[PDB]
Amino acid sequence: RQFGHLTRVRHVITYSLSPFEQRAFPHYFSKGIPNVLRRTRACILRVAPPFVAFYLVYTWGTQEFEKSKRKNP
Amino acid sequence: AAVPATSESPVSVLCRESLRGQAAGRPLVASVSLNVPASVRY
Amino acid sequence: WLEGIRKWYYNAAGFNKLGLMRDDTIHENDDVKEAIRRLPENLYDDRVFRIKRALDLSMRQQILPKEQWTKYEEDKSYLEPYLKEVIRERKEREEWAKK
Amino acid sequence: ADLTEYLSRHYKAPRMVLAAAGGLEHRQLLDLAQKHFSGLSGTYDEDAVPTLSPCRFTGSQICHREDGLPLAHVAIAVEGPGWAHPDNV
Amino acid sequence: KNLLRNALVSHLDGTTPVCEDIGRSLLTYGRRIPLAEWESRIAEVDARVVREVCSKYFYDQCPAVAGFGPIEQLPDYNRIRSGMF
Amino acid sequence: NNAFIDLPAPSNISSWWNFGSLLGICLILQILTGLFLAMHYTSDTTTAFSSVTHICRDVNYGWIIRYMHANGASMFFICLYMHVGRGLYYGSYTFLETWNIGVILLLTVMATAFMGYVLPWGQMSFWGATVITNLLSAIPYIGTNLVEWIWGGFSVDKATLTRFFAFHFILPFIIMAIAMVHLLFLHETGSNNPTGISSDVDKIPFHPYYTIKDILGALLLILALMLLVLFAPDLLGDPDNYTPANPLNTPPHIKPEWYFLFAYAILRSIPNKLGGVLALAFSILILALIPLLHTSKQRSMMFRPLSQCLFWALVADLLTLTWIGGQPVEHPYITIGQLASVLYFLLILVLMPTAGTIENKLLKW
Ligand code: HEM
Numbered sequence: 128r129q130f131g132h133l134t135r136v137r138h139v140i141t142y143s144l145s146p147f148e149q150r151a152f153p154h155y156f157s158k159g160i161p162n163v164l165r166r167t168r169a170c171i172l173r174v175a176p177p178f179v180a181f182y183l184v185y186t187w188g189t190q191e192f193e194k195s196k197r198k199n200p
Numbered sequence: 201a202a203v204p205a206t207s208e209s210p211v212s213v214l215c216r217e218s219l220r221g222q223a224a225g226r227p228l229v230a231s232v233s234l235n236v237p238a239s240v241r242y
Numbered sequence: 243w244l245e246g247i248r249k250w251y252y253n254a255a256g257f258n259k260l261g262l263m264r265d266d267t268i269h270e271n272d273d274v275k276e277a278i279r280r281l282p283e284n285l286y287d288d289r290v291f292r293i294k295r296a297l298d299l300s301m302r303q304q305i306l307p308k309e310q311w312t313k314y315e316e317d318k319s320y321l322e323p324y325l326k327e328v329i330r331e332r333k334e335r336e337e338w339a340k341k
Numbered sequence: 342a343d344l345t346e347y348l349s350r351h352y353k354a355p356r357m358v359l360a361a362a363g364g365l366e367h368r369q370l371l372d373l374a375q376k377h378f379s380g381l382s383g384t385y386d387e388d389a390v391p392t393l394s395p396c397r398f399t400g401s402q403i404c405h406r407e408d409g410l411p412l413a414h415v416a417i418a419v420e421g422p423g424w425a426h427p428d429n430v
Numbered sequence: 431k432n433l434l435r436n437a438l439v440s441h442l443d444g445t446t447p448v449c450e451d452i453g454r455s456l457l458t459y460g461r462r463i464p465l466a467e468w469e470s471r472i473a474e475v476d477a478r479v480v481r482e483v484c485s486k487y488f489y490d491q492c493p494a495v496a497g498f499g500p501i502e503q504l505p506d507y508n509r510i511r512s513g514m515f
Numbered sequence: 516n517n518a519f520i521d522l523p524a525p526s527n528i529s530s531w532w533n534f535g536s537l538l539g540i541c542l543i544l545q546i547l548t549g550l551f552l553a554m555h556y557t558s559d560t561t562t563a564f565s566s567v568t569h570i571c572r573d574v575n576y577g578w579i580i581r582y583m584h585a586n587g588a589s590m591f592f593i594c595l596y597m598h599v600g601r602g603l604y605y606g607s608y609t610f611l612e613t614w615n616i617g618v619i620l621l622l623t624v625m626a627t628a629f630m631g632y633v634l635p636w637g638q639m640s641f642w643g644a645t646v647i648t649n650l651l652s653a654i655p656y657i658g659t660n661l662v663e664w665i666w667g668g669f670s671v672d673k674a675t676l677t678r679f680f681a682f683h684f685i686l687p688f689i690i691m692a693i694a695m696v697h698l699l700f701l702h703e704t705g706s707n708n709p710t711g712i713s714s715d716v717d718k719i720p721f722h723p724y725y726t727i728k729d730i731l732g733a734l735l736l737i738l739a740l741m742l743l744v745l746f747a748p749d750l751l752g753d754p755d756n757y758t759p760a761n762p763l764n765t766p767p768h769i770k771p772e773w774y775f776l777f778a779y780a781i782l783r784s785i786p787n788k789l790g791g792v793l794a795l796a797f798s799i800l801i802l803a804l805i806p807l808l809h810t811s812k813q814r815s816m817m818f819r820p821l822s823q824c825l826f827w828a829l830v831a832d833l834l835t836l837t838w839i840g841g842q843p844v845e846h847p848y849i850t851i852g853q854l855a856s857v858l859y860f861l862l863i864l865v866l867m868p869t870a871g872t873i874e875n876k877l878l879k880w
Pocket residue numbers: 531532533534535536538539542595598599602605607608610613614616617618620621624690694697698701705706707708802
């Protein structure tokens with residue numbers, strides 16, 4: 128796969144600046160944090176639950192194990 | 201030569217103004233150069 | 243209403259947030275590639291730009307302003323008539339190959 | 342009105358040069374100048390005097406992709422010195 | 431230098447090109463620079479001067495790039511920029 | 516060039532795409548530290564353990580090369596699991612050749628790390644050699660014969676240690692050749708990306724964009740590796756391997772290397788010999804079936820909510836199995852492990868393909 132033979136594109140214009148003319152960290156915190164927060168919130172419902180379940184199964188099983196090793200659980 | 205031709209070759213008109221001058225008026229002449237783009241007049 | 247979870251799903255899937263239409267997201271197999279090849283200039287060029295705009299947003303880990311999100315009610319299958327025929331043609335050939 | 346405002350501010354005697362080359366004498370050219378361009382305005386005033394500010398150069402790129410055209414055209418350049426600089430030679 | 435000398439003199443051939451050189455030169459240089467002067471300016475250029483002036487304007491400088499047509503293969507700006515050194 | 520410098524790459528691949536180069540680095544690191552350790556290691560059972568302590572105590576910087584090799588093996592697995600997870604989530608497995616070679620790579624690295632762990636001849640070395648080679652005894656009619664043939668005797672002994680040094684020595688170079696083939700098949704298609712949509716309309720050159728990003732990734736890998744080597748070299752290891760091998764006694768709380776714990780939990784959950792071995796083999800080989808189980812009209816899980824939820828359930832389940840593998844075979848761990856083992860195969864064989872179909876329906880195609 129070589130540039131020149133990838134695919135067909137028509138009517139698209141792209142404007143760019145030299146890396147020497149611009150900042151490498153534009154609005155790093157001012158815009159970065161909001162974006163991180165957004166991304167974090169957008170996925171949390173899909174990522175976290177299974178791990179919460181793991182946590183519950185983990186704490187439940189460990190406690191159940193200890194309790195079972197003593198005279199009066 | 202040192203001077204590049206008026207039009208470099210490789211291998212629009214939509215108005216009456218840009219069309220004026222397009223009609224031929226003299227016999228054809230063909231030029232070939234060592235250093236300059238070829239041309240064909242008339 | 244199924245339809246209720248459908249609009250919900252559409253927004254959860256989220257390709258609309260990148261300005262994509264459902265058909266822009268189909269997995270490309272040979273049937274799909276042939277269908278894309280058969281698209282008229284305008285549908286092809288539009289697809290290219292939407293995908294290009296989406297790849298650019300993805301690279302910046304960004305999304306479009308909500309007003310620019312593809313709207314569920316307005317998303318239409320521009321690829322369907324083409325893909326359906328490509329599949330029909332292949333099935334016909336496969337039937338013939340068995341006789 | 343835009344055109345007259347533009348011409349008014351820019352077509353002033355001190356910004357023009359009557360030039361001639363060929364079988365003629367400078368004295369005749371000048372006399373014809375005095376004869377025909379004397380009434381040419383030599384003053385818009387002081388509130389107009391259109392003056393050029395320097396123009397910033399930006400290392401950058403503009404790509405208009407159009408695979409429908411048979412050949413690609415590419416132009417690349419660095420910032421040059423300006424007319425009057427000796428470096429041009 | 432020889433190519434330049436030939437281009438300069440062959441361009442100022444005919445009343446129109448000379449007339450234009452007069453008009454534009456007065457506006458740009460404020461005077462008509464005579465061929466003998468251009469000759470002096472050209473004669474003084476040697477390999478050292480060419481290296482130093484080229485280095486000054488081209489070497490490790492950011493270029494401006496414009497492309498139009500089937501340009502999928504036009505190099506990326508960073509790659510173009512690294513080619514400047 | 517064109518295999519690196521001007522290699523076209525998607526403009527949007529994320530950090531999840533950094534693990535391939537990190538695996539290459541883990542491989543080089545293991546080969547470099549490995550060769551240097553091999554310059555001082557002796558494979559006779561009378562001197563193996565001794566030669567390792569000699570490396571750590573008297574060879575100049577022997578200790579750092581050794582712990583870099585040990586912890587490097589752990590980093591190798593962290594990266595391998597991240598690499599496979601990326602592939603499942605984004606549908607990279609549709610690149611069939613690349614994917615299946617990848618499965619071979621996973622098995623070869625597992626076999627390679629197993630044999631290396633046997634080399635210091637500590638307690639875990641010895642019992643690991645015993646147990647794992649015995650997996651072959653589940654093969655009917657000839658299984659036991661295969662095991663004795665591998666051992667070079669009726670039990671793990673000298674003949675075993677000596678050939679394992681040889682196998683462990685050469686296998687990584689074979690892995691390197693297989694990895695080069697892995698990349699060649701990949702190059703035929705170029706990389707997939709987070710959207711699962713062709714990126715041919717927006718490719719950028721690998722250099723300088725991903726060369727610098729890979730270097731940043733390499734720096735982070737080295738930080739993680741060195742935090743372990745310089746501040747907690749034994750954290751991911753097992754104290755029992757600091758005890759020389761004792762053929763008469765299997766430590767009471769013997770447990771596998773952490774990166775093998777999930778598979779060990781699965782095997783332990785089945786109270787049948789052949790059944791446990793088949794489940795173990797299948798827990799890895801099922802990766803070869805993923806492509807055939809793909810029902811979604813879309814390649815990546817990025818736009819598939821239901822699939823994502825099941826994907827993280829699988830990761831959470833592997834985390835559960837890893838934890839269970841580290842616990843004794845007692846209540847309620849026995850049952851939690853059996854459920855987790857069943858859930859693993861159920862998510863891959865049934866729930867995910869089903870979520871794929873439901874999502875298709877919801878999108879009307
Ligand atoms: C010694 C082990 C391995 C090495 C050195 C290795 C290396 C690589 C490299 C260099 C890449 C490109 C960068 C990237 O996208 O990550 C890659 C891609 C890929 N690898 Fe591996 N790999 C290894 C094991 C595996 C395994 C175990 C699997 C999965 C079972 C696998 C599946 C894939 C797939 C499907 C791709 C394409 C990724 C995409 O484009 O999305 N690899 N590998």
